[PDB]
Write an enzyme that holds these catalytic residues in place. Structure first.
Site, PDB file in Angstrom:
ATOM      1  N   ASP I   1       0.628   4.066  -6.087  1.00 44.45           N
ATOM      2  CA  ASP I   1       1.192   4.888  -5.013  1.00 44.45           C
ATOM      3  C   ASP I   1       2.313   4.166  -4.275  1.00 44.45           C
ATOM      4  OD1 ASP I   1      -0.416   7.179  -5.357  1.00 44.45           O
ATOM      5  OD2 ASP I   1      -2.060   6.230  -4.265  1.00 44.45           O
ATOM      6  N   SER I  26       6.736   3.502  -0.386  1.00 41.48           N
ATOM      7  CA  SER I  26       5.358   3.953  -0.277  1.00 41.48           C
ATOM      8  C   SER I  26       5.327   5.450  -0.536  1.00 41.48           C
ATOM      9  CB  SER I  26       4.782   3.641   1.104  1.00 41.48           C
ATOM     10  OG  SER I  26       3.622   4.412   1.358  1.00 41.48           O
ATOM     11  N   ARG I  27       4.399   5.890  -1.376  1.00 42.68           N
ATOM     12  CA  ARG I  27       4.318   7.293  -1.752  1.00 42.68           C
ATOM     13  C   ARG I  27       3.469   8.120  -0.800  1.00 42.68           C
ATOM     14  NH1 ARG I  27       5.933   7.685  -7.880  1.00 42.68           N
ATOM     15  NH2 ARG I  27       5.953   5.442  -8.315  1.00 42.68           N
ATOM     16  N   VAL I  28       2.899   7.509   0.232  1.00 46.75           N
ATOM     17  CA  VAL I  28       2.174   8.239   1.262  1.00 46.75           C
ATOM     18  C   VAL I  28       3.052   8.499   2.480  1.00 46.75           C
ATOM     19  CG1 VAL I  28       0.201   8.135   2.814  1.00 46.75           C
ATOM     20  CG2 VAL I  28      -0.046   7.393   0.456  1.00 46.75           C
TER      21      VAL I  28
END
Ligand SMILES: Nc1ncnc2c1ncn2[C@@H]1O[C@H](COP(=O)(O)OP(=O)(O)OP(=O)(O)O)[C@@H](O)[C@H]1O
Ligand SMILES: [Mg+2]
Lengths: 150, 222, 50, 51, 117, 49, 60, 114, 100
Positions: I1, I26-28
């Site tokens: 992620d 960051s994929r969040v």
């Protein structure tokens, strides 16, 4: 099978029509591996094959009996050049004199079916489909058809 | 035997001798390169097999050169034997003009320092590059190509701006076909541009130039 | 990716070479012009010195 | 500058061109007057003003 | 031009040509600097930087990553804006004004935010 | 001065004459282009039929 | 003195006229050329529109 | 020199040097014009042009295309001819005299033909 | 992620941690931050990517407009602000104040 009845038709590498336009009357049959003309059965290439494109026709002219490679990356216009040549042959076809007419064969290997349909539509627009035959081995065909189509 | 595959396929395209009927088959194999890598295995094989190559490039395509043929590396081993006399005559100077222009392109902005001859070379090359452009699905008859190349290589485009060359060409080709089709006849039915036809074409070009309207309004006369 | 970035560097260096060679030739012409200007200025300098 | 300092002299700096301007800006030395934009092809007007 | 129309195709081709030239000049700018280009090349470089910034957009799905609500631009507005960019109408605005915005109204508002009109 | 005025007047007259000539030529060729394009449209319509 | 001034003014006016005649000439030459080019452009546009509508109706 | 001898090698190296420096001057001449060059540079350009033209020859195979028959030049004749050329002993003659000829005899004869 | 790309060239330049801002992600996103940090650092990563782009572009620019120089100065200050010695953790509120 081979004959004049293959003009204007879309077939697969076995010669079976796939355009859904019915049967194709075969003048005869021909093996795919018949040897090429020998070194003494040819003569010098001396007749222009006009592609209709100034760049080729002036800088890299193509004569009848020649093998001119069209090489480039994707989306550089290779199919456009080839279809332009096929369309340019229309006036020669209309002449009616076989010494000027050029029959066209378009072998589509591994292309998606809608791309082949687009090419056929382009050829229909320019009237090239009367003297053109399309041998289609779409991407969904077995590797055998893709290997045999040319 | 992949090389054998393609070589046996492509050697069947031949010009038969008159004893066998004089028929011919012309091949236009297409090869897709990756990252313009013509030294890959299959591109290498096919380049070896064929007579000439037309190399199409993405950078030229994006630059507006369409068809994006790299005249620098594109070759035809058959050459002039595959051209009619008019085409061979008019196109004779294209290769050297284009090569010199590509050499001089680095000096585009320093035309003051360029000697008269080199600036003329640069301008002529610009016009010629604009000349070879062609819209899709619009093949030209050989006589039309001969007249367009005659415009380019005889200096008749020297008075036209680059941005207008294409348009000029097309309109001129229309004008001739509308009112002076005999030039096209002569070329097509004799495969050469006779002196009388050449002078008539020059006069027609000059009249058209008197008629032509550049994009910016500049006169393209003389 | 090594080959990709190496080819990119080759292209960049080729463009740099072209630009630098053009500039070298332009500088040759500019030297000619500047020497001509020095020559043109010489006589008045001599006369005013005299 | 070193020679003039040895001779008990203070250099008062004047500059023609921008490269010297940057060099002396880095050195923090003050430039009383500066003329720029004609180094490639100076005219007599610039020389007259400087003189 | 047959499908998307002449103006759309023309503007797209002009944008692509400008960006290709900018890519070609990027290494020269990296080594020799931008001052050694011709005046037309300098204008093209400025125009291309603004064009590549304007091609960016604040997407609806990207708010989680930026907190900036997304925007949608009609096709006609896009064509007109990029025609103006290729013609050098916005060459005076700071390039930062073109970064992650919507249409021309957003461009004007952001330029005002940066002290330019 | 008299000769210059006469030359100006005759130049204006010749300009008017040639302007009429080129205008009629333009009308003729525009009509020719329109007829040719209409005929081609009809031909391709027949082709589509 | 007035005659000398008039002679000078007449030479100047003749020089002015030998240029203004050609100036107006070229001016309306360009006017006629632009009008003809516009006529041709509108004719081409009309033909393109006519063929396009023929395409549409034929397809329908 | 071990194989072809000293004189052959010396003449070959002189010809190579002249041709190389002319190649260097090519770009300057093309972009800036020949008049931009110095007098020594122009003398060398003339000599190098003459040398590179004399390196041409009337080939036997060329007979079919152009009627003139080909020529065989003995090695020593070539060495002496190019020694003369590198020494400027032919600069006065025009360039056209140096196309597609054989030895010095042919060069002279074509010179009196111009 | 997502990933934190660490580069030795950045490490030697003094950028510690040697996180390559342009390619690290960051994929969040803001969902993994408190509200205050998300507010102060909403577009910090894009700001720094653009700053690195401009710094590379303005390497040999004899002069810059006001906007470019201001952006370069802001980016330099942010890059300095993100440097951190090892074994020196900051509580979240301290980080919020620093980024503010
Ligand atoms: N002369 C041209 N002028 C303008 N556009 C062109 C021209 N030739 C090709 N194109 C366009 O370029 C794009 C790619 O063309 P084309 O499909 O013929 O290329 P290709 O190399 O065969 O592609 P692919 O890898 O998809 O098979 C298409 O949009 C085509 O319309
Ligand atoms: Mg294709």
């Amino acid at each position: 099978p081979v004959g004049d009845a293959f003009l204007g038709r879309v077939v697969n590498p076995l010669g079976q029509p796939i355009d859904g336009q019915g049967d194709i009357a075969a003048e005869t049959r021909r093996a795919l591996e018949l040897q090429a003309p020998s070194v003494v059965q040819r003569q010098s290439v001396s007749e222009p094959l006009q592609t209709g494109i100034k760049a080729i026709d002036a800088m890299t002219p193509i004569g009848r009996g020649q093998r001119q490679l069209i090489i480039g990356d994707r989306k550089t216009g290779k199919t456009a050049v080839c279809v332009d040549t096929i369309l340019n042959q229309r006036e020669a076809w209309l002449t009616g004199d076989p010494k000027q007419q050029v029959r066209c064969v378009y072998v589509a290997i591994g292309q998606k079916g809608t791309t082949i349909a687009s090419v056929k539509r382009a050829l229909e627009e320019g009237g090239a489909m009367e003297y053109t035959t399309i041998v289609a081995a779409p991407a969904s065909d077995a590797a055998g058809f893709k290997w045999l189509a040319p | 035997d992949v090389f054998y595959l393609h070589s046996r396929l492509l050697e069947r395209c031949a010009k038969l001798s008159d004893e066998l009927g004089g028929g011919s088959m012309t091949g236009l194999p297409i090869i897709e390169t990756k990252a313009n890598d013509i030294s890959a295995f299959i591109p290498t094989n096919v380049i070896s097999i064929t007579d000439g190559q037309c190399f199409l490039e993405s950078d030229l395509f994006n630059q507006g050169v369409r068809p994006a043929i790299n005249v620098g590396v594109s070759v035809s081993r058959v050459g002039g034997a595959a051209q009619i006399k008019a085409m061979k005559e008019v196109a004779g100077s294209l290769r050297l003009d284009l090569s010199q222009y590509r050499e001089l392109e680095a000096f585009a902005a320093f035309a003051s320092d360029l000697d008269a001859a080199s600036k003329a070379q640069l301008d002529r090359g610009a016009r010629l590059v604009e000349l070879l452009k062609q819209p899709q699905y619009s093949p030209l008859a050989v006589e039309e190509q001969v007249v367009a190349i005659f415009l380019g290589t005889q200096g008749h485009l020297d008075s036209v701006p680059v941005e207008d060359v294409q348009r000029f060409e097309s309109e001129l080709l229309e004008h001739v076909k509308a009112s002076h089709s005999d030039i096209f006849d002569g070329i097509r039915e004799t495969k050469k541009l006779s002196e009388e036809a050449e002078e008539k074409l020059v006069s027609v070009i000059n009249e058209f130039k008197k008629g032509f309207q550049a994009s910016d309004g500049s006169s393209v006369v003389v | 990716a090594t080959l990709r970035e190496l080819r990119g560097r080759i292209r960049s260096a080729g463009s740099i070479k072209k630009i630098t060679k053009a500039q070298e030739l332009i500088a040759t012409s500019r030297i000619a012009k500047a020497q001509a200007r020095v020559e043109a200025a010489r006589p008045y300098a001599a006369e005013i010195t005299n | 500058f070193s020679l003039l300092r040895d001779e008990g002299k203070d250099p008062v700096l004047y500059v023609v061109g921008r490269k010297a301007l940057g060099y002396f800006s880095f050195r923090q030395r003050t430039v009383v007057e500066s003329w720029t934009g004609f180094s490639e092809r100076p005219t007599y007007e610039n020389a007259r003003e400087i003189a | 031009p047959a499908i998307v129309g002449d103006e759309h195709y023309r503007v797209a081709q002009e944008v692509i040509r400008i960006l290709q030239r900018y890519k070609d000049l990027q290494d020269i700018i990296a080594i020799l600097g931008i001052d050694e280009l011709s005046e037309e090349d300098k204008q093209l470089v400025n125009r291309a930087r603004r064009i590549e910034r304007f091609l960016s957009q604040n997407m609806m799905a990207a708010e989680q990553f930026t907190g900036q609500p997304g925007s949608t631009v009609p096709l006609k507005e896009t064509i007109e804006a990029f025609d103006k960019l290729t013609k050098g109408e916005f060459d005076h605005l700071p390039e930062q004004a073109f970064f992650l915005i919507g249409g021309l109204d957003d461009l004007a508002k952001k330029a005002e935010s940066l002290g330019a009109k | 001065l008299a000769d210059a005025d006469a030359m100006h007047a005759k130049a204006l007259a010749d300009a008017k004459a040639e302007s009429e000539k080129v205008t009629e030529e333009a009308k003729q060729d525009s009509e020719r282009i329109a007829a040719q394009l209409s005929e081609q449209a009809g031909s391709e319509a027949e082709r589509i039929k | 003195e007035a005659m000398l001034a008039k002679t000078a003014a007449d030479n100047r006016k003749s020089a002015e006229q030998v240029a203004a005649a050609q100036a107006d000439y070229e001016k309306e030459m360009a006017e006629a050329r632009a009008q003809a080019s516009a006529l041709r452009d509108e004719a081409r546009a009309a033909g393109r529109s006519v063929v396009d509508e023929k395409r549409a109706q034929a397809s329908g």
